[PDB]
Amino acid sequence: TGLCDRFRGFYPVVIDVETAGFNAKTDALLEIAAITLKMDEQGWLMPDTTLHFHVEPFVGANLQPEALAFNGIDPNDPDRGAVSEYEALHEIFKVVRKGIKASGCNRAIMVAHNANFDHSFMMAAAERASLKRNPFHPFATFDTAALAGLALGQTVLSKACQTAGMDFDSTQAHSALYDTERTAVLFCEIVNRWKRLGGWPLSAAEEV
């Protein structure tokens, strides 16, 4: 049916984040990717709009060396094409509000791998940027680590995609955009496979 019927009004948005640490309050946000979803007329789920940004560290932001050493990001590189947290989120929020309205959903829910990590950073940044009318649910998320745990028996993203028959280039694992895309395809695959096997809608199982 309609996307608005699938998750009780929740407009699922796949989000990934790269950072300069583990602490959403103190550490900088360096990258964020966003992929909205849409359902065709037969009720199949698929990626809709894709956004991605290199993000400037907020003034007073801490930068953990090990974080940089891990994700390989150097915030001081002038060729980053980085934008402010406000600019990135404002563009993502705009697209999301559009989708919510167009789809007849009541609000957005973040889809992410170990979602709380990405949720905490995005929400913190939005707060720093004084963003109004944050379309996202304040604490609800769709953790694909848990979903993949159920659907595929794997909780690590790369193994989940592999087990799902998807490609995964560890070469791009530190890229917010790449992770977001793989996670969007993964999530869509998990949901669609549920419908395919007659798990959805709930009346399908008996109508045979």
Subset of 55-74 contacting Mg ion (CB under 5 A): none
Complex with its own copies: residue 35 or 109, whichever CB lies closer? 109
Q: Shortest approach of Co ion to residue 80 CB, angstroms?
A: 5
3-state secondary structure of 138: strand
3-state secondary structure of 112: strand
Complex with Co ion: residue 76 or 203, whichever CB lies closer? 76
Interface residues toward Co ion, by CB under 5 A: 80
Instruction: Scan for tokens 């399908």, then name that residue.
Output: 204
| DSSP-assigned beta bridge partners for residue 35 | 14, 50
CA distance 3 to 92: 19
Each residue 16-45 as x (binds Mg ion by CB under 5 A) or -, in order, gives x-----------------------------
**Max alpha carbon distance in the chain (Å)?**
61
Complex with Mg ion: residue 3 or 16, whichever CB lies closer? 16
- Amino acid letter at 162? Q
Q: Binding site for Mg(2+): what residues are annotated?
A: 16, 18, 174, 179
Q: Which does 23 bind (CB under 5 to 8 A by kind): its own copies, Co ion, Mg ion, none?
A: none
Q: Which does 154 bind (CB under 5 to 8 A by kind): Mg ion, Co ion, its own copies, none?
A: its own copies
Q: Taking each helix axis from N to C terminus, what angle separates 176-196 and 144-151, rounded to the nearest 10 degrees?
A: 40
Concatenated DSSP letters for 37-79? EEE-TT--EEEEEEEEEEEPPPTT-B--HHHHHHH---TT-TT
Task: Spot the catalytic one: 52, 54, 137, 174.
Answer: 174
Q: Are 88 and 53 in contact (CB under 8 A)?
A: yes
Q: Which does 80 bind (CB under 5 to 8 A by kind): Co ion, its own copies, Mg ion, none?
A: Co ion
Stretch near its own copies under the rule CB under 8 A, chosen from 23-31, 51-59, 77-85, 137-145: 137-145
| DSSP-assigned beta bridge partners for residue 50 | 35
Between strands 107-112 and 136-143, the pairing is: parallel
Q: Shortest approach of its own copies to residue 61 CB, angstroms?
A: 21
Say whether residue 197 binds its own copies (CB under 8 A).
yes
Say whether 174 is catalytic.
yes
Residues with a catalytic annotation lie at 174
Using CB under 8 A as the criterion, which residues of the chain lie in contact with its own copies when the complex forms?
5-8, 10, 109, 114-117, 139-143, 145-147, 149-156, 159, 163, 190-191, 193-194, 197-202, 205
